[PDB]
Amino acid sequence: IVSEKKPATEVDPTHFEKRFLKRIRDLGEGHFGKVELCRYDPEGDNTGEQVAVKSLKPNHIADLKKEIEILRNLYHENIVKYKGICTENGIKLIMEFLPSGSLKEYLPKNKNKINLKQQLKYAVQICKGMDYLGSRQYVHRDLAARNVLVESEHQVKIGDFGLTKAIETDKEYYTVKDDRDSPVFWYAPECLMQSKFYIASDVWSFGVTLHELLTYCDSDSSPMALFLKMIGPTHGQMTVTRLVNTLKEGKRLPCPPNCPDEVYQLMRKCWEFQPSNRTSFQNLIEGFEALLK
Ligand SMILES: N[C@H]1CC[C@@H](Nc2cc[nH]c(=O)c2-c2nc3ccccc3[nH]2)CC1
């Protein structure tokens, strides 16, 4: 009786079996799906490694697959490490688990531990990861303090790439078609007006991320809370056009409390109305380093 001979099974370390991936809790609820803390426990004794698992809620599978392929080929100390995948056409993205979470979770609870010097070092690391992303012709489109993971007191990593798009060679921007649900209070005017995304658009979002970092991610002084005070919080569908109008008028987020003018000036260089007039990530690194020593 016939039976197929089995060759030597080259066991894949980036392949995680669904049966061993055991859910612990929810970490976040992103744009398209969910992120959960799991323990890959093949020995079934609660000793397995803790991993961050990104999946979809039951179309948008194409976006997750493209996000997986982007992260798989990113290698930088300030970019969350890709660990692998869990296959079914359904797919799950496995990433390293950073128990400190994002700056949004970490900063309000560790104010006494993080001084201005440490805040400027995080800013340098965010810029380096962002510059590495830009050099590989990519636009992040979701740079906020909530997407900056804390590895330790001395190291941060860009931890989510759900909205990352590639900029075509011999082209300066990407045109978004699905601009819902956009983080409008973090976006540059060209993103809000014409739905165009340049590298300079990410520099604008960095300025906003830097403002959050300096305010230790306090909810009351958040970019959304502050801009809604400037434009009005009861405009509904007229919020974005009022936001564009306010930015055109020259109005920008105020100086964070206890932030020196020289840091605020670097932040202002990120907020030039025209993308071509904005500072680069490399000029920001230079700027922060100069203030460090
Ligand atoms: N705010 C979004 C950041 C991106 C995603 N989160 C990741 C991703 C990859 N690796 C991680 O370790 C985490 C992580 N989030 C945590 C939330 C609380 C505590 C620990 C956490 N770890 C979703 C939430």
Curated annotation (Swiss-Prot):
Superkingdom of source: Eukaryota
Post-translational modification Phosphotyrosine, affected residues: Y173, Y174
Subcellular location: Endomembrane system
All copies of domain Protein kinase, residue ranges: 21-292
Disulfide topology: none
Active site, renumbered: D142 (proton acceptor)
Residues the entry annotates as binding ATP: L27, G28, E29, G30, H31, F32, G33, K34, V35, K54
Organs and tissues of expression: Expressed at higher levels in primary colon tumors than in normal colon tissue. The expression level in metastatic colon tumors is comparable to the expression level in normal colon tissue.
Post-translational modifications: Autophosphorylated. Phosphorylated by TYK2 on tyrosine residues in response to type-I interferon signaling, leading to its activation. Phosphorylated on tyrosine residues in response to interferon gamma signaling. Dephosphorylation of Tyr-173 and Tyr-174 by PTPN2 negatively regulates cytokine-mediated signaling. Ubiquitinated by RNF125; leading to its degradation by the proteasome.
Domain free text: The protein kinase 1 domain is also called the pseudokinase domain and has a regulatory role through the transactivation of other JAK kinases associated with signaling receptors. The protein kinase 2 domain is the catalytically active domain.
Stated family: Belongs to the protein kinase superfamily. Tyr protein kinase family. JAK subfamily.
Connected disease: Autoinflammation, immune dysregulation, and eosinophilia: An autosomal dominant disorder characterized by immune dysregulation, severe atopic dermatitis, and chronic gastrointestinal inflammation. Additional features include asthma, food or environmental allergies, as well as poor overall growth with short stature.
Function: Tyrosine kinase of the non-receptor type, involved in the IFN-alpha/beta/gamma signal pathway. Kinase partner for the interleukin (IL)-2 receptor as well as interleukin (IL)-10 receptor. Kinase partner for the type I interferon receptor IFNAR2. In response to interferon-binding to IFNAR1-IFNAR2 heterodimer, phosphorylates and activates its binding partner IFNAR2, creating docking sites for STAT proteins. Directly phosphorylates STAT proteins but also activates STAT signaling through the transactivation of other JAK kinases associated with signaling receptors.
Self-association state and partner proteins as the record states: Interacts with IL31RA. Interacts with IFNGR1. Interacts with JAKMIP1. Interacts with SHB. Interacts (via N-terminus) with IL2RB and IL10RA (via its cytoplasmic domain). Interacts with FER.
Name of the molecule in the record: Tyrosine-protein kinase JAK1
UniProt source species: Homo sapiens
Included stretch of the parent chain: 855 to 1154 of 1154
